[PDB]
Amino acid sequence: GCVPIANAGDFGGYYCPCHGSHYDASGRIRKGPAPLNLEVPTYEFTSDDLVIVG
Amino acid sequence: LSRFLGPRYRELARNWIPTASMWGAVGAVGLVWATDWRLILDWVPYINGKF
Amino acid sequence: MLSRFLGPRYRELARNWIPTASMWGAVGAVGLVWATDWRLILDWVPYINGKF
Amino acid sequence: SHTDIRVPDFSDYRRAEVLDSTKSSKESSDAR
Amino acid sequence: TLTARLYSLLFRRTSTFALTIAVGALFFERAFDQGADAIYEHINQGKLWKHIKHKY
Amino acid sequence: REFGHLTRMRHVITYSLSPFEQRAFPHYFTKGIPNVLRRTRACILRVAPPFVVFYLVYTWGTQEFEKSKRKNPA
Amino acid sequence: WLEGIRKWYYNAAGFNKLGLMRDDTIYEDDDVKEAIRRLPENLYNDRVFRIKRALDLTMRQQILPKEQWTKYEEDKFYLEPYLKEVIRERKEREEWAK
Amino acid sequence: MTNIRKSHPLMKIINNAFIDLPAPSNISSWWNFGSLLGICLILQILTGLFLAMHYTSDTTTAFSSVTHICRDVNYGWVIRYLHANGASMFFICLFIHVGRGLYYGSYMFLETWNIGVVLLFTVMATAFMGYVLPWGQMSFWGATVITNLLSAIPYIGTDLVEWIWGGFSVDKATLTRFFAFHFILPFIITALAAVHLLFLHETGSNNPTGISSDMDKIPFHPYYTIKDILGALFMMLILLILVLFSPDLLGDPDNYTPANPLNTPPHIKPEWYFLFAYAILRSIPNKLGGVLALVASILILILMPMLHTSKQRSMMFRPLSQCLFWMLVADLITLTWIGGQPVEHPFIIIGQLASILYFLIILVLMPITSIIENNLLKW
Amino acid sequence: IWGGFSVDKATLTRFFAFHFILPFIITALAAVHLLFLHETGSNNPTGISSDMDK
Amino acid sequence: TSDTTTAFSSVTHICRDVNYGWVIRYLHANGASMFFICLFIHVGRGLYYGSYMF
Amino acid sequence: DLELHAPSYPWSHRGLLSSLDHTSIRRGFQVYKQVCSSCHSMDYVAYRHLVGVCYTEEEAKALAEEVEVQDGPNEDGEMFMRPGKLSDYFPKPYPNPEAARAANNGALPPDLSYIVRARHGGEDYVFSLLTGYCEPPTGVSLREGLYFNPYFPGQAIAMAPPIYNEVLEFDDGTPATMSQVAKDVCTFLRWASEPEHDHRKRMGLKMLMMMGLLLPLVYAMKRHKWSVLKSRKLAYRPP
Amino acid sequence: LVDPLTTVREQCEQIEKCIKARERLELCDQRVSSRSQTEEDCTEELFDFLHARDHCVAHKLFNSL
Ligand code: HEM
Ligand code: HEM
Ligand code: HEM
Ligand code: FES
């Protein structure tokens, strides 16, 4: 996480400005040395105001 | 090896298959009992009250 | 450990092994002062004392 | 026979002091 | 021979052997430590704290 | 298994010499160096080839990797 | 010819250097353990001294002078008959067990 | 009335095990490693205790404790680096011991061989937990990866992994239980090594030639005891060079960064002595297949007495088989190097071939070759 | 033994270490205890040798 | 965790927030008490029936 | 990608039995205190370790009391601020990691108590890094705030140029050239990572000598006591 | 004030390894600049140039320091 944005940047929601693999609005990396996008947990949207995660 | 099979060993096996197979049954029952395998105990009358 | 061990042969055997046992004790004492680096002996010694 | 057997020559391995057959090893026993 | 006198004097008795070993270690530790420290300070001269203490 | 129930042997004569009259380093270099050379000759042609082919594989992998990390015309 | 490769492997094996004739290098299993026992006295004593020589040489990491290297054509198989007999008896015993 | 060496009940076993034990006369230096293992274990016990003297197995203070050992405690750095390099040297001698067993046909001794396989397993597990203890970046991340490997087991995978973790991820509980397990296991290794020696003493020993040495046995005391001491001195030489001239030569510097469960290190390579299996784990694309290959790589030693078919016990007199064995050693070195390297184009295929050939030598090539010289030597 | 000038950090840590190691020494000494006992056999309440009633 | 800032907290953690941990801890303590009870009875047996002759 | 490795510089302590120039350690502490301590930390090193390495007791005490370090709750119920002493570790510049990340562009200045034992390459890395700053090559446009350093992995370090010519005045009077400053700070950081660097080497020296003495004699003992078996000269006399 | 670092930098840049490394560098730069929308970086050529310069520079410099 080399000096990244706080849900901002050119590419909508998120974007890594130090290395490549620029994040997306949903966090997908564009192209570069990042092994994957922003880490995503096992969310459980079984009801509103709950969305259980890990 | 070639020392196995042949006449004598096959009726030896036939003699010991019930014992070995039902020892394996002993092991299966012991394993499911010790580990409390919910999957198997779903289909026994009394022990459904656990869960 | 009684009158059995007291006798002229046993006294002579004691005398025979006194030099060996005594200088074994000397060995033990030298080893102890060496291992512990006992200053209260080693200060009085020659060149060794220059370590401190 | 027991007479026939003999010790093979060890002269290749001996120490310098005990190498001649006329001297006695007692003299150089302390040295070795 | 010097070795022969040495053995006849203080090597025959195993207890005298031990006494010789111990008293030899007494001075061997001193000599070896002095010599090794000497070699080490000679190799690293002007760099150790002892060599540069006098400035401050 | 201790000495006595080990084997049966006959007509075997064993001589020996004490460690106190035989030099512990009898012609150390003079006979050792030909001995080591002979031992090395016996086994070099059967020990080294796998190691040298490993060396070739390793070096080849090193460059092949760093070439793969190099640029490319576009 | 095939004898060429046989001789080449015999020379490359190295037990001829130590004076051993093939049979001296056998791994001692039960059948072998009986095979040595059934050997006559003279052959057994010769074998045991020969193995003593090899153990001495290996401890010293030396070999015999070139002359006293047991020839391929002189490697007598003193154990093959006894070992083969033991194997045949074992096979018959197993067959009766069947 | 009788020698205390062979009269005292406690002295009986010691005399029959180290003093009057009949040993082969032509034992080479390759057997000295048997002592080198055991002695080394004692250092690991001796040093490892003193590390346990000043160590708080807690996530917030484990690394601080290790630094305080290496920086504040009197000669603590000596003990720490002696311990780490002693573990590495221990694995060096373990590999050499297994190689000697493979070469001179010692796996005919069965019970000792299987007990040695169990020893190997326990020692590798112990080293794994030990590397977990310092709680550096590589410590934590390698532990996470290696324990996640257990998720490949069907059905009980996740629950077993969470059980080993002691929670949801490698954390307080994992480190705390790993320390206690690392304390207990070496004593299991010691008892099992006593069992190893007990089993070995009944069959004497395998001399390099491979033929029975029952008729050339020699007393143990004036002999190898001194040779074993010389071997231990050489081992101390290597270990002291490693500790005193380059303590972190065999160790990744990244471990010195405190374990942060937010940053994956550029490389997750385990210690040098595990990559040979780790590379195999990388080779198989399937996760479960990878774990099975990893465990079978060590387990293959058990099958060795079964696969032997050459009528000669030892490898001294089997040239082609010797070439095969040295090919196996080269394969092991190649696997270690491949495990060191990342997973890229040139290394993936090399790892595949290395794993395949390493298994092929042990299972197929060696026995098939062993048939060949038997046919060649008129038997 | 204290590891310092009073019972403090070092004392607690080293006491944990020694308390961990020692019971295995107890086990070893107990094995030797049994080893020594076997060479004579247990003593019956009557004290007199019971080699005719084992 | 053998540290003077967490040892007591860790023990409370074992007794309270560990699955069947109080059982283990009190088993340890009372097992020590019973171990010494048995040791004292064993020493008394050795003294009484003259087992120190071994 | 690519990772430009640091060339092996000929450090004075690089030698097999060569220890660090302790005067260079004294100089390299000052740069840490006046330059690197502004954002970085050395939490694992206290003023106590400094004495006998590059400072004497009174200078260490004065240096420690130059800064102000927090002590425990006073007899009133709150923190009371006190000058430092010998047994106080090097002051943290930022109250918590979050404050450190926020104060900078968003990165974290790693603690230097182990930065030489954590970075692949060691001193040769850090020195080169501090001297590796340059204009980014054409075709590369780093974001505002990022600085280009080839040695840094990713070439996008968030570090302002720390060392420029004449950054601080060395007390002894050595020139403040950037190379000198970087060399001294790298030696100091190596000492911080490996405080035993001197004694270890010294110990190694002794191990070299006596094991050069024990090894032959012990070997000389072995061949002494093993010569009986090596001169056996067996014989066979069957009937 | 004159730093020996810059001095050693220049006299080492005079080496022929650095000469051809620089040649590839100024061959890369305009190739990238003239190409209006290319996605190439001259970082590789700069890396080779810096390696060639720095291995050489390490040999010098410390003597002057
Ligand atoms: C079987 C022998 C042993 C092996 C192979 C072994 C291996 C290791 C290794 C590789 C480490 C990591 C060291 C590091 O990364 O710096 C380690 C750490 C540790 N070991 Fe052991 N160990 C052994 C025995 C023991 C024993 C018996 C104890 C306890 C008495 C112990 C206590 C420790 C402790 C406390 C640590 C953490 C401190 C450290 O990192 O060095 N070890 N061990
Ligand atoms: C805990 C580590 C181990 C210790 C302390 C140990 C101890 C020993 C010792 C002292 C010997 C006698 C010396 C020798 O022959 O080399 C020996 C022999 C042996 N060990 Fe081990 N061993 C260990 C691990 C292993 C392993 C991993 C194996 C292989 C699976 C193994 C199998 C053998 C065999 C087959 C022998 C007989 C060698 C022979 O006499 O020819 N041991 N062991
Ligand atoms: C670590 C704890 C101990 C264990 C595990 C242990 C183990 C044993 C065992 C299992 C027996 C045989 C059963 C019996 O006769 O009572 C025994 C006998 C004996 N133990 Fe212990 N013991 C321990 C402590 C002691 C102590 C403290 C003493 C006294 C100093 C002692 C002296 C004896 C004696 C004299 C016998 C022989 C009893 C007889 O012949 O009747 N033991 N020990
Ligand atoms: S900085 Fe956000 S991951 Fe690249």
UniProtKB/TrEMBL annotation, chain D:
Stretch forming the signal peptide: none
Transmembrane segments: none
Subcellular location, record wording: Membrane; Mitochondrion inner membrane
Domain of life: Eukaryota
Protein family (similarity comment): Belongs to the Rieske iron-sulfur protein family.
Something else known: The Rieske protein is a high potential 2Fe-2S protein.
Name the UniProt record assigns to this protein: Cytochrome b-c1 complex subunit Rieske, mitochondrial
Entire protein: shown range: 79 to 110 of 274
UniProtKB/TrEMBL annotation, chain E:
Gene3D superfamilies: Cytochrome b-c1 complex subunit 9
S-adenosyl-L-methionine listed as a keyword: no
Keywords: Electron transport, Membrane, Mitochondrion, Mitochondrion inner membrane, Respiratory chain, Transmembrane, Transmembrane helix, Transport
Coiled coil (UniProt feature): none
Top-level taxon in the UniProt lineage: Eukaryota
Recorded GO CC terms: mitochondrial inner membrane; respiratory chain complex III
InterPro entries in the cross-refs: QCR9, QCR9_sf
Compartments (UniProt record): Mitochondrion inner membrane
Membrane protein topology class: Single-pass membrane protein
Cytoplasm among keywords: no
GO BP, one annotated term: mitochondrial electron transport, ubiquinol to cytochrome c
Quaternary assembly: Component of the ubiquinol-cytochrome c oxidoreductase (cytochrome b-c1 complex, complex III, CIII), a multisubunit enzyme composed of 11 subunits. The complex is composed of 3 respiratory subunits cytochrome b, cytochrome c1 and Rieske protein UQCRFS1, 2 core protein subunits UQCRC1/QCR1 and UQCRC2/QCR2, and 6 low-molecular weight protein subunits UQCRH/QCR6, UQCRB/QCR7, UQCRQ/QCR8, UQCR10/QCR9, UQCR11/QCR10 and subunit 9, the cleavage product of Rieske protein UQCRFS1. Component of the ubiquinol-cytochrome c oxidoreductase (cytochrome b-c1 complex, complex III, CIII), a multisubunit enzyme composed of 3 respiratory subunits cytochrome b, cytochrome c1 and Rieske protein, 2 core protein subunits, and additional low-molecular weight protein subunits.
Assigned protein family: Belongs to the UQCR10/QCR9 family.
Name this polypeptide is given: Complex III subunit 9
Organism whose genome encodes this protein: Sus scrofa
From TrEMBL, chain F:
SUPFAM superfamilies linked to this entry: Ubiquinone-binding protein QP-C of cytochrome bc1 complex (Ubiquinol-cytochrome c reductase)
GO terms classed as biological process: cerebellar Purkinje cell layer development; hippocampus development; hypothalamus development; midbrain development; mitochondrial electron transport, ubiquinol to cytochrome c; pons development; pyramidal neuron development; subthalamus development
Transmembrane intervals: 43-61
Localization per record: Mitochondrion inner membrane
Membrane topology term: Single-pass membrane protein
GO cellular component: mitochondrial inner membrane; respiratory chain complex III
InterPro entries given in the database record: Cyt_bc1_su8 (IPR004205), Cyt_bc1_su8_sf (IPR036642)
UniProt key word Mitochondrion: yes
Protein family (similarity comment): Belongs to the UQCRQ/QCR8 family.
Assembly mode: Component of the ubiquinol-cytochrome c oxidoreductase (cytochrome b-c1 complex, complex III, CIII), a multisubunit enzyme composed of 11 subunits. The complex is composed of 3 respiratory subunits cytochrome b, cytochrome c1 and Rieske protein UQCRFS1, 2 core protein subunits UQCRC1/QCR1 and UQCRC2/QCR2, and 6 low-molecular weight protein subunits UQCRH/QCR6, UQCRB/QCR7, UQCRQ/QCR8, UQCR10/QCR9, UQCR11/QCR10 and subunit 9, the cleavage product of Rieske protein UQCRFS1.
Name of the featured protein: Cytochrome b-c1 complex subunit 8
From TrEMBL, chain I:
Binding positions (heme b 1): H33, S42, N43
Subcellular location: Mitochondrion inner membrane
Binding site for heme b 2: N43
Top-level lineage group: Eukaryota
UniProt-annotated binding residues for heme b 3: H19
Ligand binding (heme b b562): H19
Binding site for heme b b566: H33
Transmembrane segments: 15-37
Binding-site residues, ubiquinone-10: H38
Annotated residues for binding of a ubiquinone: H38
Positions with a binding annotation for heme b 4: H19
Summary of subunit composition and partner proteins: The cytochrome bc1 complex contains 11 subunits: 3 respiratory subunits (MT-CYB, CYC1 and UQCRFS1), 2 core proteins (UQCRC1 and UQCRC2) and 6 low-molecular weight proteins (UQCRH/QCR6, UQCRB/QCR7, UQCRQ/QCR8, UQCR10/QCR9, UQCR11/QCR10 and a cleavage product of UQCRFS1). This cytochrome bc1 complex then forms a dimer.
Job of this protein: Component of the ubiquinol-cytochrome c reductase complex (complex III or cytochrome b-c1 complex) that is part of the mitochondrial respiratory chain. The b-c1 complex mediates electron transfer from ubiquinol to cytochrome c. Contributes to the generation of a proton gradient across the mitochondrial membrane that is then used for ATP synthesis.
Similarity comment: family membership: Belongs to the cytochrome b family.
Name assigned to this protein: Cytochrome b
Source species of the chain: Sus scrofa (Pig)
First-to-last residue of the parent protein present: 164 to 217 of 379
